[PDB]
Design a protein around this ligand. Sequence first.
Ligand SMILES: Cc1cc2nc3c(=O)[nH]c(=O)nc-3n(C[C@H](O)[C@H](O)[C@H](O)COP(=O)(O)OP(=O)(O)OC[C@H]3O[C@@H](n4cnc5c(N)ncnc54)[C@H](O)[C@@H]3O)c2cc1C
Ligand SMILES: Cc1cc2nc3c(=O)[nH]c(=O)nc-3n(C[C@H](O)[C@H](O)[C@H](O)COP(=O)(O)OP(=O)(O)OC[C@H]3O[C@@H](n4cnc5c(N)ncnc54)[C@H](O)[C@@H]3O)c2cc1C
Ligand code: SF4
Ligand code: SF4
Ligand code: F3S
Ligand code: F3S
Ligand code: FES
Lengths: 111, 131, 631, 257, 127
Amino acid sequence: VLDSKVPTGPIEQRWDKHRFEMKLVNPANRRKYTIIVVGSGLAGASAAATLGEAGYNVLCFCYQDSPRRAHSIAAQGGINAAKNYRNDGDSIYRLFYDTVKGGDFRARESN
Amino acid sequence: NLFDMYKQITGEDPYETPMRIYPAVHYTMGGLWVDYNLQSTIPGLFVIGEANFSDHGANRLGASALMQGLADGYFILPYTIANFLAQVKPGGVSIDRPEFAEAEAEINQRIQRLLSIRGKRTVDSFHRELG
Amino acid sequence: VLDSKVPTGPIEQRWDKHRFEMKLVNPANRRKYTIIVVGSGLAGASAAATLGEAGYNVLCFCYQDSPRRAHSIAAQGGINAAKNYRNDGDSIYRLFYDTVKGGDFRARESNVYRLAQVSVNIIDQCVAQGVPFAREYGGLLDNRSFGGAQVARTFYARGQTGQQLLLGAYQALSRQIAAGTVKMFPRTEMLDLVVVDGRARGIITRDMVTGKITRYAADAVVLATGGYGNVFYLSTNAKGCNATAIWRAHRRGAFFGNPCFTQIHPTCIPVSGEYQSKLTLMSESLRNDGRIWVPKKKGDTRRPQDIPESERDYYLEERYPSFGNLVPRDIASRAAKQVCDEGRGVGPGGLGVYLDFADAIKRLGRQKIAERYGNLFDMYKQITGEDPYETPMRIYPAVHYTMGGLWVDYNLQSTIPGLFVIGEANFSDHGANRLGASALMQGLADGYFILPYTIANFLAQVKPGGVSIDRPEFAEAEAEINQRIQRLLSIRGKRTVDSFHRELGKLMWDKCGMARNAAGLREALQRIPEIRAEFWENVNVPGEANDLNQALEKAGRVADFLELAELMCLDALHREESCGGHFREEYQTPDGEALRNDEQFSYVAAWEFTGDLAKPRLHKEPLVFEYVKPT
Amino acid sequence: MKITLKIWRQKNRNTPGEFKTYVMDNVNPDMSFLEMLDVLNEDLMSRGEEPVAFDHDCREGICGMCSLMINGVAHGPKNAITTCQLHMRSFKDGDTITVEPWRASAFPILKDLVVDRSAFDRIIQAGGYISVSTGSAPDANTIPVSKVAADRAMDAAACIGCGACVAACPNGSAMLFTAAKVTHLALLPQGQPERYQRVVNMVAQADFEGFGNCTNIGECAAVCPKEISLETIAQLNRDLVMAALRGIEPNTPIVPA
Amino acid sequence: SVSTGSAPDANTIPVSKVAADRAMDAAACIGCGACVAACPNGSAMLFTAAKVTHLALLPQGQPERYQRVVNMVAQADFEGFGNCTNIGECAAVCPKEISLETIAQLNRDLVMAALRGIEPNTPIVPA
Ligand SMILES: Cc1cc2nc3c(=O)[nH]c(=O)nc-3n(C[C@H](O)[C@H](O)[C@H](O)COP(=O)(O)OP(=O)(O)OC[C@H]3O[C@@H](n4cnc5c(N)ncnc54)[C@H](O)[C@@H]3O)c2cc1C
Ligand SMILES: Cc1cc2nc3c(=O)[nH]c(=O)nc-3n(C[C@H](O)[C@H](O)[C@H](O)COP(=O)(O)OP(=O)(O)OC[C@H]3O[C@@H](n4cnc5c(N)ncnc54)[C@H](O)[C@@H]3O)c2cc1C
Ligand code: SF4
Ligand code: SF4
Ligand code: F3S
Ligand code: F3S
Ligand code: FES
């Protein structure tokens, strides 16, 4: 069986609630763990860098000459954010609604 | 920029001749199923970016794959992987375990078999037929 | 009866709702009110500076040469905030939960949430004031992990974060003094509280340079006078730290909230003789990479490095095998005190235990241990003359913090209207155990972001002025102070003030210290009146009143301590449970931890001065936990 | 250890003082200097004499009120420490130690070894701050401060205000203290709006309080407990030159209350 | 050297459009190494100059810029690249048309860092 493990309550506080309820590793103990990160694209490089900043031992891998060669480098269009810098009605809820409706209601709302 | 790149690739200026286009598969919203903690069915295996199914449903919006990858890397996985790791003991598994030997033997046998076929067809021929 | 005056509804909006519902004083009318602020520490300086910025007339007092000489410049550890700059899951709710659980569920939840909520503004204000917090190479702030937290939420300015925080507060106070909104009275010690018509309407002070007794009248009084941890003679506090102001307020009508809640520091440099009264606070991370032991033979005169491994009694290893060498500060320090009281003689006077780093140096790199504890080892070698790299370091527990103090409501107001207590002088947010980097946060929060609202709420409901220093109450308080000073100077006994303070501190450390039991507390309650009578009949205070008499200051502080200690012992005897710093030997888990009685002792004990020092009246303030359930 | 102490004894501001000789037969090498003074005070009290008055709160070299000129060196023979951090193992058996207060016009002597260092407070009051009120501060990470600038501003900011720089300066000048505060506030962006005013004001206050000038001798840095460098004085000099180029004139001096 | 979660609001620090355009001209470097290949000295001057200019032109790269250039230059010396005779083949063969103004910017930054007494750190040793 698949457990989505999504939090309960209002969707605006679901991520904050989950962050509070989830366990933590002490900054001193993070050096005791090893995380392998297969991939150095946007997700892979960001994850490896953030886990190294945290203090974990990260083993990052990529099949290319350099980590900077992942096809995330090939992306041309920009990156979306719900900052409403243009005073055009954008919001976190509007971006969430647009992403749920654009995917034709085939994804979990919490994510 | 688009017309210059098209003229470089094709040798035809789109200011005089019509440009040529053709559809091609661009993205995969599918991938390994992950829960809210970005963890797959296998405990300890986390899938982030385009390799998991995650947030795009049946159609990825523009500028969302970069957003999803950076979100998973920066602001989601550091929390969920810590949540997983705090509930387990660090270390305890070395590369001399029987599982590592079995996986390595499987990989070596696959590589040797691939090199030993020596057929009449190239790899790209089969990939082209499949595609 | 005690009215906490906490707001209702969700805990996240309680502070905003209260701030909206509080009354306000117009900026034009603020010049018509006078606020006396006794104390210039973090809480005192922040409060005086913020109230001067508001527009009030502030009368700030301190017994030191300068406001900057106040305690909490000695605070080495950083200051906590729920900014989540390390992306490690910290939040305002997480800080609130950690502070409620660290205090062992003995504090009001609303105050703790307000503290955790305003910590972020504390850090913003400190950075804007020019506090040189640690930065990383990209220009942004750097966080490090503190005790009691699994997140890196602590902002630090090298090893002297408290000094820089108090320097920023003192620079704001100096700005307000230059602007004329704050009148500073350094080297002036408040000796009494003048309560007129039921309101704290002034103070009676003594200028300890000329000996002049002065009376100041104000519309509000704030007591940011720090903790009373010097009731134990041997402590980590500054030499001048006392409880004179809060005890005078308590005798005037202020209820003492949980006076027996005292904290300790496990790692302190021991004393070299009966002359010493201060134990220098070493960082308690020295226990992470060191081993605690004493020689098995008491008369081992060999050098500690020459004692064989088999001839070393590595207690905290044989005893308490679980969590060995990382036992909580209370258990380890109780074991250390028991070992030193049995008689080992590893120190000058026998009070000390070997925290050695020899095995840590061999296991790790001496360069890495240097990068960890270089300033600590240099300071220990300066004080003791012994290099910790070769010789085992000596440590001994000492009383560090007092989570007790005058009971205050949600508005930081005592049971006396117009008397506000902030900082370590009140009970407030720490419950039964103060978390690391939480007292700096509490003092700055009270000074900057809480008291400016609550004191305005109080002042808007009263008329400015109307009380002058010629009132009979000021005359009575001044006469009481003068009679006490003359009596203290006229005893001409055979014992010094420090002799009585040492006796009192030894009794409080043995009986009302880290390990407390009913028989010992009753013995202390018998002995304290005897020591107080011996003080008032046989103390030697030389000099004159109208002179720089430091012996007079010490005599007054010890005279207040001798009364406060009886209340502390009574509160410790009354609380038939173990919670946080307060430990009872008959209420403990088999592992040695505290064993709370949440059914009968889930309240705040506010003690009322009834005129009899042995029979104060107990007022329970019930504790209800709606968000952090006790466990 | 047998230790002879020639201690300055002054009854008050107006009464002239004199050196009095006190012999201590048993002095612990582990005893700190202030603890030895405390033992002497108890002995004097037992003998009926007036105990020696000296300033002390923290006994950690952080607050700054411990202020003694021991054997001619401020804060004792050992450098980079305070009077409270000085321990009697730094001396030898039979030594004679001369204990003095700070001698400066702006640091009036109130008792045996106690001086009045409120002139430092008035120098701070004359612009040694950042004029930011409570509640108006932006987010803490809004303005980036480089790690080197933060480290230098912490080196300057680590000043305990003991006044030993004024005492060991042959001119009795507060240029190390003023320079340390000026450098601390100048090295951070938050201190940029007022710095060229601030330095002038602070310097003027040091002139008004009654301190001397800086002959660039350097005893201040030699006796500074916190090892504050003369580069703080160079930074203050640069700031004052630039402010004079900008026509910055000092405000009205802070008058004692 | 900015960690995750510590970043302020994106619009807090204003970056002028010209500075952003120049920093994007320098930042558009695909790391192909053709500058080293066509340089007669085998120098990484154009690549290092592009990165140094990209970070130096933004206010976020200021706090550690004068260290960075020195360190980066030292690394190029440690890795085994040549020196810049200002020949200019790197800009001639650069796919992204990175100008020699990046090398001039690096030279200015290194001169200023030498004036500040900036010392290179220990070079990055291959793993
Ligand atoms: C031409 C193009 C244009 C695009 N434009 C946009 C756009 O405008 N907007 C948008 O939102 N998205 C766009 N995308 C999609 C987006 O770039 C990707 O979906 C996104 O980068 C996926 O994130 P990632 O972390 O998986 O990056 P990836 O680059 O996909 O990560 C792959 C990494 O894993 C490593 N790796 C892979 N397999 C192995 C293996 N077996 N062993 C070891 N390492 C391995 C690779 O070396 C590499 O480092 C575009 C994609 C392409 C191809
Ligand atoms: C060595 C040490 C390290 C510490 N480190 C930390 C730490 O890292 N983090 C943390 O959160 N807490 C720490 N603390 C605890 C806390 O910061 C301080 O102990 C302090 O008590 C809190 O500041 P405060 O303003 O409330 O008290 P104080 O700063 O002690 O306030 C006392 C003020 O009141 C004045 N005053 C007192 N009595 C009178 C009187 N009778 N008349 C007139 N004026 C009077 C004094 O002159 C002074 O100005 C530490 C404590 C010590 C001793
Ligand atoms: S500059 Fe040094 S010597 Fe002068 S007051 Fe400050 S700490 Fe003391
Ligand atoms: S040739 Fe241009 S794009 Fe390629 S590495 Fe050199 S500078 Fe970068
Ligand atoms: S010693 Fe004196 S001459 Fe100047 S540099 Fe210091 S104040
Ligand atoms: S061609 Fe060579 S000399 Fe310098 S400008 Fe380019 S690396
Ligand atoms: S007593 Fe505080 S610096 Fe010496």
